[PDB]
Symmetry: C3
Subunit: 581 residues, 3 copies
């Protein structure tokens, strides 16, 4: 507060001031132009190529047992796998569901032959292997090992030959120059190797005579032809149905189908936002040439497929497709297939690498969303504020006429004296006067002229604590008027409260009564409340559902662990340096 008093000499043209005129208020931004569309999002494909294959091989075993007195002991059990020749796969196994009891094949640069039970060759029926949970189908000919008849004090050999046929899952990873079987065996030939148109261009690490391709092939299940591939390796023969590389594999995978994908141009790039998955992708304005995608023949297909299925299910009756689907590369390695729409209301080759984290895009979407909202609303507050200030000037132009000192003091920033000199305002500073130098007189009446009373209290004061006593009249807000003119006709029931210092001086019947604190008068406010509080600090702690360790441990068997342990066997349970001689 300022319970300090003031004297305000009449202002002279010395200083003149004018009110600032209306400011040009801001205008609301044009507004973003969004394009309704359907989108299909693709990601780098990390899944291997999977296809069915059949294995044809024979387990060949030759035991050596020495029959001692009362017992017999294995001296050695030689085991090996032999590939079933093409001819035999075609004419025996596939044609008749049978297999020879002999195994003739090349091993260690030598053609070796093995007869089951060691006797004359005979065709054998393939029978279902023994059931087993979570396993493919298998078939074999024999089920018992063949050991030599006993002959004491002698070493004898026995040959076993179990013809085995197994259907197995096959897998291949880019660039598909080789593949693996579910048994752990690698095949160093492309799953797409063949003779038909350019196929022979694919990779193969085997001599020509090891591979065979049979057209219009029919398989027998122990109804359409297939081009059947047949590769015979040193340990087995493997077959699979040949299909062309390009309409089969893809370096991308469909990831998200988005009904409502808004697109907008902004600072040289497109923003693709999906309210449904709370994501915003960013791309250049120029489409990405789909043909540049190394083996991505599934994208166009998949997008069209999904795209039409969505159009029908949701826009066929309210919008129209605007042009051909477009393709864009988003930051993070996401390929977006986009189909613009519009409501009727109007009427070198390379591989894309994708990030495993979509968080940046969700943060982008979230941030953009809040940002847009706060800039929009606070922007409106600003415009409304400016407008209100401009509007207010009109009221101040009228107030300044009724009370120039008060309006000027508020506007100038300090207690001043003022008066209108036309359309401008002349002002002069007022001089402070210590409260202890001001005396309020007991009477407001004028004996001089009966019936006439002063309208406000009379006073006596001095500018300096030692200075002379000057008489005047009390004005508003502690102003000391040098003239005692404020008068009126004495009235009955005279009651008044005048601002005096930090409280009021009360008069009744034109006589001083007493002073008081503002606390004795009830207060009413002209102010409109507004309780704004700050958004408080918040801390985000690291948080994971599963740690890399839990994940590493989610696997039943750990190859590294198993190898580490198993290879310590000798250092643990055996001597390695002792040379017995």
């Amino acid at each position: 507060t300022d319970a300090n008093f003031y004297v305000c000499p009449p202002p002279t043209g010395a200083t003149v001031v004018q009110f600032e005129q209306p400011r040009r208020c801001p205008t609301r931004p044009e507004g973003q132009n969004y394009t309704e569309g359907i989108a299909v999002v693709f990601k780098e494909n990390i899944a291997p190529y999977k296809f069915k294959a059949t294995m044809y091989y024979k387990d060949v075993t030759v035991s050596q047992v020495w029959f001692g007195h009362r017992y017999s002991q294995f001296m050695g059990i030689f085991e090996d796998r032999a590939p079933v020749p093409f001819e035999e796969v075609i004419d025996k196994i596939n044609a008749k569901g049978v297999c020879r009891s002999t195994a003739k094949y090349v091993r260690n640069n030598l053609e070796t032959t093995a007869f089951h039970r060691d006797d004359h060759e005979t065709d054998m029926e393939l029978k279902p292997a023994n059931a087993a949970t979570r396993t493919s189908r298998g078939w074999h000919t024999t089920d018992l090992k063949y050991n030599p008849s006993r002959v004491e004090a002698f070493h004898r050999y026995g040959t076993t030959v179990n013809c085995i046929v197994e259907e197995v899952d096959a897998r291949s990873v880019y660039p598909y120059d080789e593949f693996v079987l579910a048994t752990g065996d690698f095949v160093y030939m492309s799953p797409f190797y063949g003779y038909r148109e350019g196929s022979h261009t694919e990779h193969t690490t085997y001599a020509a005579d090891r591979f065979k391709q049979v057209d219009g092939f029919y398989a027998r299940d122990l109804t359409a032809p297939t081009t059947r591939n047949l590769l015979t390796t040193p340990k087995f023969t493997v077959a699979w149905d040949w299909v062309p590389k390009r309409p089969s594999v893809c370096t991308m995978t469909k990831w998200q189908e988005v009904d409502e994908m808004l697109r907008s141009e902004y600072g040289g790039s497109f923003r693709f936002s999906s309210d449904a998955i709370s994501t915003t992708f960013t791309t250049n304005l120029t489409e990405y040439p789909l043909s540049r995608v190394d083996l991505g023949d599934c994208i166009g297909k998949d997008a069209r497929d999904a795209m039409d299925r969505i159009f029908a299910r949701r826009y066929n009756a309210t919008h129209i497709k605007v042009g051909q689907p477009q393709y864009y590369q988003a930051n993070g390695g996401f390929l977006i297939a986009y189909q613009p729409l519009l409501s009727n209301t109007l009427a070198s080759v390379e591989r894309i690498k994708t990030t495993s984290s979509i968080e940046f895009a969700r943060l982008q979407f979230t941030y953009n969303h809040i940002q847009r909202h706060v800039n929009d609303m606070l922007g409106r507050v600003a415009i409304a504020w400016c407008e209100l200030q401009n509007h207010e000037l009109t009221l101040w132009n009228e107030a300044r006429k009724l009370n120039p000192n008060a309006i000027a003091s508020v506007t100038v920033g300090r207690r001043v004296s003022a008066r209108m000199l036309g359309d401008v305002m002349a002002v002069s500073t007022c001089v402070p006067v210590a409260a202890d130098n001001v005396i309020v007189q007991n009477s407001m009446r004028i004996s001089s002229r009966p019936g006439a009373c002063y309208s406000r209290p009379l006073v006596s004061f001095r500018y300096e604590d030692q200075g002379p006593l000057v008489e005047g009249q009390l004005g508003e807000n502690n102003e000391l008027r040098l003239t005692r003119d404020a008068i009126e006709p004495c009235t009955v029931g005279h009651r008044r409260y005048f601002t005096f210092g930090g409280g009021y001086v009360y008069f009744e019947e034109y006589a001083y009564s007493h002073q008081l604190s503002r606390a004795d008068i009830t207060t009413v406010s002209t102010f409109i409340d507004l309780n704004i509080t700050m958004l408080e600090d918040h801390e985000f702690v690291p948080l994971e559902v599963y740690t890399r360790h839990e994940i590493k441990d989610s696997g039943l068997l750990d190859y590294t662990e198993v190898q580490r342990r198993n290879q310590l066997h000798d250092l643990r349970f055996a001597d390695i340096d002792t040379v017995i001689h």
Copy 2:
């Protein structure tokens, strides 16, 4: 900087001020319930238990002794299982094992004697030390090779009884398991005889399994010891019931303060502590529906009580018995309401991010809506409040107030409690002249309070007399008069500046820029939140994680299987 003439308004057009609008009200406010919660996630950890392996390393070498040397012609190596009886009576009961092996290998009952000597029981001594390895025990430590007999082939046998303690792991549905050695055991770790245990899975003949009640583990309390003898070994592990041993769910987070609220037919569980907000249907999730999840009810209470005591026992009270809800993302929430005293498997996502974004978004949303709502309300109140001032201001200067409210220069005058307005006519600045004297030539001591003017509506029109009003208004009636006074100084708005007069005599025009300006405006400087781009960011990429493994099985196999193609001939056949 345009002049206007405003004719007296006629009842022609009458306007009124809009009255106070109904101001918005603050929304009710969300009701939150305090509570304790435990969050479960899909269990991806393998069932783990200890087991012992009993088997013998059977080796039989063949050596051909040359004159100046000796050379191996072959080295048969096999693994023979140790018979039940021998583990029971010899290993478990004595800590010894036979120096011979007899088992079924390739549909034949083979038999081997260590050193090829008579059967002897042998001392099982601890295996040689090795870092990060379980405990092991064996009998022999050397390989027996036939004594030299130049020019002949000879076969020598070896038998090293080995017992190993090893970790066992099994994954749902637990119908089989594996050992630290990589050996699979196709029998449920919970297979047995005791109540329904025989129901479990097994792929062996009844006579390969054996259960020993009240067994007493030897060490080179009772347990219902299980023993399986496989073609290459025998393994034993303590039998325990299935249900109280495994769980398809895992405790993930313990939450002291988990607020719950209901909106739009869903429950929102948010944790300030971990900045997460889960969402669920209002209906609880039948904990009984959880395939093998008896650990849930357990862990939950355990934790909820520990927390209750540690933090709310002295200030709040539990309400009802714990509830269970299925949240989006596959998280199971055990919830325990509080109050101030005052059959299938659940699949869980590996990313909690959606729920934290949810929490973050919700928290900010709540705040801006709350505050901007208060601003909207206060703005409406202020506008209504101001009307009272406009009502007084209009009686004082109708033209000005009406012009601001109407939006264009108009004329106005009150007609009771309503305002009559009429449009004003613009006048080119060049068609306006200010006369030099404000004094009245026919009445002594009487002066015009405001400057007189001579103008013409049209550039060719007659010259009209009148006096300058405020804000460039041209008054047709020169009735603004006052007693002439001494020291007369005045500045009148004229065009885009002021016309200065002294002692009722024109002096000169000035620019507003020549006069000091003071503002009646309260400033406010709002700036926009600027654009921000978030780039892709990962601590470890999936490639780094793949490389984190010491050995890669695919890589190893890929390379090893190329051996013959790289260092040998796979096609050439020799005949002679």
Copy 3:
């Protein structure tokens, strides 16, 4: 609307009121102080130590072949790998690039010897292994397998010895007490084991004689060549000191502009470029307390300097020495402050950086909204204080209206100096109020009332009282508002819910407020709420896709391969 009339008795000092004086407005917070700086963020290293090694071994094979009359059959094929002796590697392989056609080594506690083709030992020239995609380099001496010469009705043995030398990649994980080769072969010796200064302290599970270290070795700069001979092979690799060689941390992010600030007794490192804010204590982290983390200080400086040069050398100056802090989540931060010219342990890092991006995002928005709304609150307080001055003049002009608005109910008011005396007005039913037809004063020609006359009763049965219409439906008890009768008299007086129109000082008719054009004194503001939004779970790759990304699954291959006998053979049957 109100729809109710009021009689307002003259106020008596009974109740007096004053306006609240200006409130002290809030002040703008000081404002956060940010230190510009360069940073380098490190994470726990999950990558194994990698180094090159060379393998020396020999494929030894002894086949047993029985020569039938028309055919031939392998009776058994013994295959083994033999380590190449130190001496041979040195003097034969490394020296002349050849190898012995013989394999002498220890197997199963016995020293066996093998002669290729079962012939006299001869030095053989090593040759490049057959070409193969994505494979290291290898060399061998023989291409074919040797088999016994044909001899009908006889068992025969043939020996093949193929000397093989392969350059392979080696890998080792902390504590580095052992390592593996690309072949899957484990080597239980520290890649750092040796003789030179404390090396012998490193781990090793082999007898001293198996190991050999050759200083000043060749193969164009000498090296300390290690050579370990295991039961199945001999491996060599250039020795290097452990300390500088391996690291338990990995440089992760190089940040040009990393702002640092402190609050609540903690440091905040925020990067606008990667949208991340790290949190740490005010106390540096002893870099030396980092187990084997010798790469940190080096990499930090290399990076730090490169960046300073490229971006701040011409406008900023380094301040102090590089400082190091540990951030929540297990991130080690190397920080270099700038200014314009104007026991021991291993850090464990989280896999998810999201908490830190959320932190940054939230702080950025929080900072912005608190700033602007805070400015709104200040401007609002100032405006409320500012307008009191207008209210001070208004109250003088229309005390009843200004007081009614400030008091919150219809009251009567008058100034008693600088305070306001007020009294409550009494309501009157609209049906108890009658507007006279004339505003003319018969008993005083030329004199007319400026506002309509009325009659009314406080109660539906009470006497009828005379008076005149005031503003906003006030019923004044004194018919004193008079004026000079004039021409073309036109007036609209608020009456009930609308107006009463008077012409030529004569009642004409009443009308709805709808008959008059409405203009507004209100400034509009259209604020709308930010709407609810649901974030659904979303992953690029599920953990199952990741699991499946591996070409061969060991668990799957083992599970299946061990079911061979159970599927294609009888395990329980003795004959």
